[PDB]
Write a protein that binds this DNA or RNA. Structure first.
Ligand SMILES: [Mg+2]
Ligand SMILES: [Mg+2]
Ligand SMILES: [Mg+2]
Ligand SMILES: [Mg+2]
Ligand SMILES: [Mg+2]
Ligand SMILES: [Mg+2]
Ligand SMILES: [Mg+2]
Ligand SMILES: [Mg+2]
Ligand SMILES: [Mg+2]
Ligand SMILES: [Mg+2]
Ligand SMILES: [Mg+2]
Ligand SMILES: [Mg+2]
Ligand SMILES: [Mg+2]
Ligand SMILES: [Mg+2]
Ligand SMILES: [Mg+2]
Ligand SMILES: [Mg+2]
Ligand SMILES: [Mg+2]
Ligand SMILES: [Mg+2]
Ligand SMILES: [Mg+2]
Ligand SMILES: [Mg+2]
Ligand SMILES: [Mg+2]
Ligand SMILES: [Mg+2]
Ligand SMILES: [Mg+2]
Ligand SMILES: [Mg+2]
Ligand SMILES: [Mg+2]
Ligand SMILES: [Mg+2]
Ligand SMILES: [Mg+2]
Ligand SMILES: [Mg+2]
Ligand SMILES: [Mg+2]
Ligand SMILES: [Mg+2]
Ligand SMILES: [Mg+2]
Ligand SMILES: [Mg+2]
Ligand SMILES: [Mg+2]
Ligand SMILES: [Mg+2]
Ligand SMILES: [Mg+2]
Ligand SMILES: [Mg+2]
Ligand SMILES: [Mg+2]
Ligand SMILES: [Mg+2]
Ligand SMILES: [Mg+2]
Ligand SMILES: [Mg+2]
Ligand SMILES: [Mg+2]
Ligand SMILES: [Mg+2]
Ligand SMILES: [Mg+2]
Ligand SMILES: [Mg+2]
Ligand SMILES: [Mg+2]
Ligand SMILES: [Mg+2]
Ligand SMILES: [Mg+2]
Ligand SMILES: [Mg+2]
Ligand SMILES: [Mg+2]
Ligand SMILES: [Mg+2]
Ligand SMILES: [Mg+2]
Ligand SMILES: [Mg+2]
Ligand SMILES: [Mg+2]
Ligand SMILES: [Mg+2]
Ligand SMILES: [Mg+2]
Ligand SMILES: [Mg+2]
Ligand SMILES: [Mg+2]
Ligand SMILES: [Mg+2]
Ligand SMILES: [Mg+2]
Ligand SMILES: [Mg+2]
Ligand SMILES: [Mg+2]
Ligand SMILES: [Mg+2]
Ligand SMILES: [Mg+2]
Ligand SMILES: [Mg+2]
Ligand SMILES: [Mg+2]
Ligand SMILES: [Mg+2]
Ligand SMILES: [Mg+2]
Ligand SMILES: [Mg+2]
Ligand SMILES: [Mg+2]
Ligand SMILES: [Mg+2]
Ligand SMILES: [Mg+2]
Lengths: 136, 74, 55, 104, 180
RNA sequence: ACCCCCGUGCCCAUAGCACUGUGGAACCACCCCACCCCAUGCCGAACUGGGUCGUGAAACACAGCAGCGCCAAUGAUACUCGGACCGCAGGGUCCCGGAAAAGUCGGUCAGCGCGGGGGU
RNA sequence: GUUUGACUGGGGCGGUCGCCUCCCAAAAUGUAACGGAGGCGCCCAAAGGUCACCUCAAGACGGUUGGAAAUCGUCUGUAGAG
RNA sequence: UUCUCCCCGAAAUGUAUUGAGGUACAGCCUCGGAUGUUGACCAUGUCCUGUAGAGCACUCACAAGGCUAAACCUUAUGAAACUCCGAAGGGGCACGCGUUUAGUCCGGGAGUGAGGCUGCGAGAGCUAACUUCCGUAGCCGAGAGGGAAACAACCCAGACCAUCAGCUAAGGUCCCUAAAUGAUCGCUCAGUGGUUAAGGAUGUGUCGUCGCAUAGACAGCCAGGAGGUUGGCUUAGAAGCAGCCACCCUUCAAAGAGUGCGUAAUAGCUCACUGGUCGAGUGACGAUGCGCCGAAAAUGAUCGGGGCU
């Protein structure tokens, strides 16, 4: 979620997913197909959603995380400066990036627990399995 | 805030291969970015200038190994 | 080679303009013979989409 | 420490001067003073305490200083030159200078 | 398993299912074009855990082990597939998955067996006999137990690639909470 | 000419470090003592100065060694000049040359001079 | 008899005017916004001239009213200091 | 702010201004003299650069562990104000290895100093605006002609004059209008074409991954579907099925301490699985082409219309 001290501001641009893998930290994982921002909530609700459908088990891994601060109209117009320091925090994700990963649950077990968290997400997604093994 | 100030114009004035005169300015940069080589002087502001007329040439490998030098023609 | 000017210079970027002039083609439909040389082939390879080069 | 020498060796901007470099190097009670062409990759006129025991007391550098001074003066070549090293002035090293300078 | 044509020409590839690739022993390397269909039907059976034979058009059979594979984001299918060679009994270190056989009595205790790391690099000797898997007995460990890399069985003198004390399998405790 | 040592360059880690083995009256080094030259804001440790024995220990010098460093392909990709496009938009594609970073295969524990002292 | 500034997503209220540094700035220079951060209106008779020598931050071990931190010792120490 | 034809032909940027819709200077236009390829494009050669991308070696941030809370190790990331690195392009100089035709200086006269749109690169904005502010190309501006129904900017294209002549560009060739109700192979039953999305579906067409075949599976129909037993905890009781913990054993051609329905609780009815009866395929995940639903705003409707399978 919202983090400790920073640079405090940003603009915006979009490429393709750089540091997201295919797999990591578990059997099954979740992958975003569309460039977008994810907020402090969303993924926070996604954790809660997924975990609710589990035993509550601590087997869930979230590779994503909010860094980028966003802003908003104090009330209205253009009068004055750029403003809105805390409105919300976002985490940019690009396609192919892996978002969440789970541990030790079965096939349908994590299929449905990803599906529940599929909603609450501004983008379409697909879960996965491991073939490419890369650790270095 | 709104307070940023001035252009400052630092550059490499005469690039390698070029024919300098005596007193021409070869580089404008900040502290050490280029080291004065053979036939090249340096001022208060750093900023290499030409000691002797001729052809200017760049020499570097890595780091602070960058050098600007002159040689005559005839 | 063999060069001819089909698409015009209206609405095209600046450098390509001068090069149409360089090759000496003024009206479209124009055609002229050219040498095989480093600087000339580079002048057609610049504007290649504006010309049908016969061979 | 080992930058003692390289403070001095770089202290003399070499080919910008137009002069030559004279490297005095002391190790034992013997000194070897040699003169080098800076621009070119070469050396000019050697001296030594090696074939010596001219004087008994180091300050036999007087001999090798005058030995270089004469050995060089056959090639012509006298202006200032004069490198030095980690070693200070006066004493044993200035017995070499005044043997060359004013002695050459 | 097999390939015929392997040109430098790029656009002859995706007209059929084929992956742009290479192979090298350091004595030589060369152009590659490999059928994708039977490849991921093959690599699936093998990975880095073992080598398979290659037959190029022109009657040349050189046995090789899969090394690194560059995957396309936004898709499943791979775009690259690097290959390496075999010189017995020296050859390069091989990544070995941790399969965790038997049910621990600590998973019965309300915990979960979790493998911190898989595909251990190790090495040696024969790349005929390569360790295509790694058997690790977990019935001994219960809760809070961290099985390190010095406890892992690797027959025929296969030296550990990483630190001996590096944690591979650790069973994680049951979910706990106290304060409101 | 060759072996090697002392000096001093060019190059300006593929020439660097640690593990380590050879080296000793010829060269280097420590060691030796120093009221004064000279000098440590305390100590001659450092400069400095007077000289052997000893020692080859330290420092230095060369040979070894590819564990670490440093250099590092070919393949593919990212991106992109130019051409031609799809999407309400975030964004994406096709052709055309150009073409990285990382990673792997590997490659190394340098090269090239000037002068002088000493063995053959 | 006259004066009572401008900027300004209308004017006013608020803020802002000159100077230095970074980002914006699209690998030349240049480049705007009431865009994103921060400083200046000094000091230094030695913090200058030159001439010589000197090498830092930090960690670990061991050490005395002194322990997070001190002062000393050895080791590490392309700069992690100034 | 009044008579004609001809030649050229801009500017809405910079800097400063009691300056902001005004002036000065420079930039851009023209006339004349001088000079004379010095201009232009493109190619080679050579230097300069830190964005794109990438990458943690520095600074800030940050995911899961290991270790005895910083450091440290395995694994893993973000970055306008981070950089171990780093293009494509861009800039200067030299050369003309080869095509072109401008360029500079001196002097007379100006105007413009309110710009606009689109694509690309950013900021601000809400990754809103026929927004706002810079960069960059092209057009309108000052541009007629063809196209986009109408339509500054978009696509194709720069109008010296005449012709009841010819070839093409963008776009088109059923009728309203010119011109194939052309051809070959597909696709779409929606008027989709000719209103947007999350999400949803045995709509169809091309590929793919698998698992059960005549040793008779998927459906259909006949029965069986049993034994500790009401597994323990908890609740007014909870006996497969409120519910948290667990989910072993017996019999067997085979039957989960069990999937749905049911009761206040067991009963009661099917499935899971076995046997029989009958025939040849049948079931499950993703990829893709084109469709479906999702799809409500105010005077009368419609793709320009007629109309089109
Ligand atoms: Mg963008
Ligand atoms: Mg990476
Ligand atoms: Mg600036
Ligand atoms: Mg270098
Ligand atoms: Mg030496
Ligand atoms: Mg001897
Ligand atoms: Mg001593
Ligand atoms: Mg040693
Ligand atoms: Mg390559
Ligand atoms: Mg791509
Ligand atoms: Mg393009
Ligand atoms: Mg469009
Ligand atoms: Mg793209
Ligand atoms: Mg091109
Ligand atoms: Mg390309
Ligand atoms: Mg290339
Ligand atoms: Mg590389
Ligand atoms: Mg390697
Ligand atoms: Mg060595
Ligand atoms: Mg020699
Ligand atoms: Mg006003
Ligand atoms: Mg206002
Ligand atoms: Mg006003
Ligand atoms: Mg203010
Ligand atoms: Mg710039
Ligand atoms: Mg630029
Ligand atoms: Mg401007
Ligand atoms: Mg501004
Ligand atoms: Mg801003
Ligand atoms: Mg005209
Ligand atoms: Mg000013
Ligand atoms: Mg004017
Ligand atoms: Mg004129
Ligand atoms: Mg006249
Ligand atoms: Mg000419
Ligand atoms: Mg010129
Ligand atoms: Mg020219
Ligand atoms: Mg950057
Ligand atoms: Mg980037
Ligand atoms: Mg940067
Ligand atoms: Mg590297
Ligand atoms: Mg370059
Ligand atoms: Mg005038
Ligand atoms: Mg007039
Ligand atoms: Mg006037
Ligand atoms: Mg004005
Ligand atoms: Mg204006
Ligand atoms: Mg403007
Ligand atoms: Mg914003
Ligand atoms: Mg506007
Ligand atoms: Mg106007
Ligand atoms: Mg028009
Ligand atoms: Mg115009
Ligand atoms: Mg028109
Ligand atoms: Mg019309
Ligand atoms: Mg229209
Ligand atoms: Mg319009
Ligand atoms: Mg008009
Ligand atoms: Mg176009
Ligand atoms: Mg005309
Ligand atoms: Mg016609
Ligand atoms: Mg056409
Ligand atoms: Mg008709
Ligand atoms: Mg027809
Ligand atoms: Mg959908
Ligand atoms: Mg059925
Ligand atoms: Mg019940
Ligand atoms: Mg309830
Ligand atoms: Mg259950
Ligand atoms: Mg019953
Ligand atoms: Mg029945």
């Amino acid at each position: 979620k919202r983090t400790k001290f920073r640079k405090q501001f940003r603009g915006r641009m979009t490429g393709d997913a750089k540091g997201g893998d295919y797999v990591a930290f578990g059997d099954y994982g979740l992958i975003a197909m569309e460039p977008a921002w994810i907020k402090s909530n969303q993924i926070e609700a996604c954790r809660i959603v997924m975990s609710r459908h589990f035993r509550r088990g601590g087997k869930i891994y979230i590779r994503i995380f909010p860094d980028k601060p966003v802003t908003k109209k104090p009330a209205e117009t253009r009068m004055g400066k750029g403003k809105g320091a805390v409105e919300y925090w976002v985490s940019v994700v690009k396609p192919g990036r892996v978002m969440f990963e789970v541990a030790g649950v079965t096939e349908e077990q994590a299929k449905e627990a990803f599906r529940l968290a599929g909603h609450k997400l501004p983008i379409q997604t697909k879960m996965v399995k491991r073939e490419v093994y890369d650790e270095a | 805030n709104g307070r940023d100030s001035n252009p400052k114009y630092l550059g490499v004035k005469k690039f390698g291969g070029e024919v300098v005169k005596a007193g021409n300015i070869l580089v404008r940069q900040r502290g050490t970015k280029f080291k004065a080589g053979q036939g090249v002087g340096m001022g208060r502001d750093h900023t290499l200038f030409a000691l002797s007329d001729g052809k200017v040439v760049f020499i570097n490998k890595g780091k602070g190994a960058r050098f600007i030098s002159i040689e005559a023609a005839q | 080679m063999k060069i001819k000017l089909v698409r015009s210079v209206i609405g095209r970027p600046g450098n390509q303009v001068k090069t149409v002039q360089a090759l000496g083609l003024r009206k479209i439909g124009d055609s002229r013979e050219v040498s095989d040389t480093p600087a000339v082939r580079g002048m057609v390879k610049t504007v290649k989409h504006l010309l049908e080069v016969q061979e | 420490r080992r930058k003692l020498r390289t403070r001095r060796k770089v202290r003399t901007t070499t080919a910008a001067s137009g002069r030559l470099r004279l490297s005095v190097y002391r190790s034992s009670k013997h000194i070897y003073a040699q003169i080098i062409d800076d621009s070119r990759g070469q050396t000019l006129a050697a001296a030594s305490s090696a074939a010596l025991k001219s004087g008994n007391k180091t300050d036999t550098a007087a001999a090798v200083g005058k030995a270089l001074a004469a050995a060089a003066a056959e090639k012509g070549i006298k202006q200032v030159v004069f490198d030095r090293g980690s070693y200070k002035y006066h004493g044993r090293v200035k017995a070499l200078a005044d043997a060359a300078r004013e002695g050459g | 398993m097999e390939l015929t044509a392997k040109p430098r020409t790029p656009k002859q590839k995706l007209d059929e299912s084929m992956i742009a690739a290479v192979a090298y022993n350091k004595e030589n390397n060369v152009s590659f074009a490999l059928d994708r269909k039977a490849f991921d039907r093959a690599f699936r059976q093998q990975s880095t855990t073992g080598l398979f034979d290659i037959t190029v058009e022109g009657g040349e059979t050189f046995p090789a082990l899969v090394k690194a594979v560059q995957m396309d984001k936004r898709k499943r299918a791979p775009i690259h597939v690097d290959f390496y060679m075999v010189t017995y009994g020296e050859p390069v270190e091989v990544s070995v998955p941790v399969h965790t056989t038997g049910r621990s009595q600590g998973e019965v205790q309300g915990g979960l067996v979790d493998i911190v790391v898989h595909n251990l690099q190790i090495v040696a000797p024969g790349p005929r006999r390569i360790p295509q898997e790694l058997v690790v007995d977990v019935t001994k460990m219960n809760i809070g137990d961290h099985i390190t890399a010095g406890d892992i069985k690797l027959p025929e003198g296969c030296t550990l690639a990483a630190d001996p004390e590096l944690t591979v399998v650790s069973v994680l405790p049951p979910r706990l909470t106290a304060e409101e």
